[PDB]
Amino acid sequence: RKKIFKPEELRQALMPTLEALYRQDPESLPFRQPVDPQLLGIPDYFDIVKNPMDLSTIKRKLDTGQYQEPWQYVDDVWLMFNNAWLYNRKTSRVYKFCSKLAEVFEQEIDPVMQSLG
């Protein structure tokens, strides 16, 4: 169950799954930068969402070797999705985009997680 990974090998394996999310347009656009509640006029955002996450943060973490094992990366992507599903209404554009991104990610990440072990 224990396994160590070289950060550079994780980067090469996982980065295509991240790039896949960025390539979804329009669906990735709400997720490319951290939610700024003041700028977006959603002042309750940080009361609802205790641990924000977005693609730019995940990309930086992947580039700077902050993921030592693949589930740490997967956890951040899922956190991003979970936050958007929590904060936004089911009828909303962002919620619907999130659901689409989650489908893309599942298809991308499963073969990678199999290959990494």
Ligand X SMILES: CC(=O)c1cn(CC(=O)N2CCC[C@H](C(=O)O)C2)c2ccccc12
> Closest approach of Cβ 1 to ligand X, in Å?
33
Nearest to 31 by CA among 98, 106, 93, 104: 98
Tell me the window of 8-16, 56-64, 82-90, 104-112 that interacts with ligand X (CB under 6 A). 82-90
Number of residues that bind ligand X (CB under 6 A): 11
Question: Is position 17 an interface residue for ligand X (rule: CB under 6 A)?
Answer: no
Least distance (Å) between residue 92 CB and ligand X: 7
Instruction: Work out whether 79 is an interface residue with ligand X (CB under 6 A).
Output: no
Compute the least distance from the CB of residue 87 to ligand X, in Å: 5
Tokens of 42: 């959603």
Report the distance separating Cα 22 and Cα 59, nearest Å: 10
43 makes contact with ligand X (CB under 6 A): no
Among 87, 102, 105, 109, indicate the residue that binds ligand X (CB under 6 A).
87
Interface positions with ligand X (CB under 6 A):
26, 29-31, 35, 40, 42, 84, 87-88, 94
